[PDB]
């Protein structure tokens, strides 16, 4: 199926007494794999299959790198605030990563945000930065003048990131590549007099990606469907639902298996 690896950074200027100034967390798919912040000042594993398969040297090396990245992030956020003439607490964020799709193709992405909004977005295919405004445009011109760094980022997204992901996928395969099929039921109830709500509910499934819809016999999708979020149930599995009201049938697809419930 589709898998992804990504690393986030978050920088907060003038943080409250409890909030750290800098946090970095990595993910494989929906699973945290690594964590670092300005208080621990240590990069640590966040999944046992990460801890068990990477030697201490890995954590020690990336700890040193993160301590450097933390300082840069603080300085970059200060410069951004100055450009915008902003005072008080603001945020700066980075996301880098890649996906390996089932069909074999890959994606890579590298993006920055300021105060939780898109700021700069890297296009690895064109080797250029998209800027949302003139401040980002200022930063863009600096970065685009550095040809080697752009090439390095492209190479990391397309080759290194993908190799890390495959490696991590193998480490956590018993978790990441398992399948737990959904438990699906359809509930019926007259709500407001004259209107019967139909809920198609799924739970107990992994991976979280699931497709759910309602169809009217025979096969036409209709029409004002309400979708429930895919939510973690706490035991590593997920739950979700879709509802309509009024021959209907709920259709569920999960991990290559299709399910139909006639109402």
């Amino acid at each position: 199926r589709t898998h992804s690896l990504r690393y986030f950074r978050l920088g907060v200027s003038d943080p409250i007494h409890g909030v750290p100034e800098f946090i970095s967390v990595g993910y494989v798919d929906s699973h945290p794999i690594t964590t670092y912040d300005s208080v621990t000042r240590q990069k640590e594993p966040r999944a046992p299959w990460m801890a068990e398969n990477l030697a201490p040297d890995h954590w020690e090396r990336y700890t040193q790198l993160l301590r450097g990245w933390q300082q840069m992030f603080k300085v970059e956020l200060k410069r951004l605030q100055r450009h915008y003439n902003h005072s008080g607490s603001h945020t700066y964020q980075r996301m880098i990563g890649c996906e390996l799709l089932e069909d074999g193709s890959t994606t890579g992405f590298l993006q920055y945000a300021y105060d939780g909004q898109d700021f700069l977005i890297f296009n690895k295919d064109t080797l250029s930065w998209l800027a949302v405004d003139n401040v980002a445009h200022t930063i863009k011109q600096a970065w685009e003048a550095n040809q080697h760094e752009l090439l390095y980022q492209k190479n990391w997204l397309e080759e290194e990131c993908i190799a890390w992901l495959k490696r991590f996928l193998e480490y956590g395969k018993d978790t990441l590549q398992r399948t737990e099929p959904p438990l699906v039921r359809v509930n019926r109830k007259e709500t407001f007099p004259g209107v019967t709500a139909l809920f198609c509910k799924a739970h107990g499934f992994y991976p979280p990606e699931i497709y759910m819809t309602w169809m009217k016999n025979g096969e036409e999708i209709v029409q004002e469907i309400d979708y429930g979020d895919i939510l973690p149930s706490g035991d590593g599995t997920y739950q979700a639902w879709a509802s309509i009201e009024l021959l209907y049938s709920c259709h569920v697809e999960h991990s290559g298996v299709h399910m139909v419930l006639q109402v």
Partner: antibody, heavy 109, light 113 residues
Framework: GQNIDQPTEMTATEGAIVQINCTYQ??????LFWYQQHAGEAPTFLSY??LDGLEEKGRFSSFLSRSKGYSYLLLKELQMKDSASYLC??????????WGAGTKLIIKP | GITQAPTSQILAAGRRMTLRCTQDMRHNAMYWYRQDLGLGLRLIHY???????GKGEVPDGYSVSRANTDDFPLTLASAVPSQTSVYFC?????????????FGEGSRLTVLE
């Protein structure tokens, strides 16, 4: 483990061309640097490659093939002053440099 | 840009030695290498930014500190003859990216019994 190899020494004739090879066996790859170091002097940056191809700077060109795992530094129209050691260095998966032992280039007048 | 001192020193075995290295280019990353005949540069210690340092390939017998961006001193607490070498300090605007290294001169140290 990890390994970066370049010939100990090369000799070519003044006015001619020499190609200095550097092959690398590393877990991952984040680019390859060439440095020049004259005898009794400090090394100085010449080049960086990370994608496939040839990049030209004056009489010096640096080539990279990622699939074949090697780079070369190409010097054209050799001059006596090109006598120096040339250091190859590869950035591995954890962004650390691994240095080759250097190639001493000798030039016959 | 970046400077090392002393650039030459003879030292009796057992004595304490500190090699100084300063750069004024506001580089965050600094490195100490030793260069020996027949070998590639070997990293002793490094520092990606002020307030941290990390061990290189051959850290034993050496120590560093990085209180400040500008300076990266290399200390031999009790020098031994095998620490006879040429020491190079280098800096880079940032550690781990495509920005090149800038080397000091650097320092020929001879340790004799």
């Amino acid at each position: 483990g990890q390994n970066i190899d370049q010939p100990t020494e090369m000799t070519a004739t003044e006015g001619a061309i020499v190609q200095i090879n550097c092959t690398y066996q590393t877990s991952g790859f984040n680019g390859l640097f060439w440095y020049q170091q004259h005898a009794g002097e400090a090394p100085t940056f010449l080049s960086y490659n990370v994608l496939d191809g040839l990049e030209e700077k004056g009489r010096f060109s640096s080539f990279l093939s990622r699939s074949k795992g090697y780079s070369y530094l190409l010097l054209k129209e050799l001059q006596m002053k090109d006598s120096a050691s040339y250091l190859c260095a590869v950035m591995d998966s954890n962004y650390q440099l691994i240095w080759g032992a250097g190639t001493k280039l000798i030039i016959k007048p | 840009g970046i400077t090392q001192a002393p650039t030459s020193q003879i030292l009796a075995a057992g004595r304490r030695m500190t090699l100084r290295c300063t750069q004024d280019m506001r580089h965050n990353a600094m490195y100490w290498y030793r260069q020996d005949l027949g070998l590639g540069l070997r990293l002793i210690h490094y520092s990606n930014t002020a307030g941290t340092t990390g061990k290189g390939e051959v850290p034993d017998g050496y120590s560093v500190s990085r209180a400040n961006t500008d300076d990266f001193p290399l200390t031999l607490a009790s020098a031994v003859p095998s620490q006879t070498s040429v020491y190079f300090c280098a800096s880079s605007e940032a550690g781990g990216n495509t920005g090149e290294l800038f080397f000091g001169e650097g320092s020929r140290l001879t340790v004799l019994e």
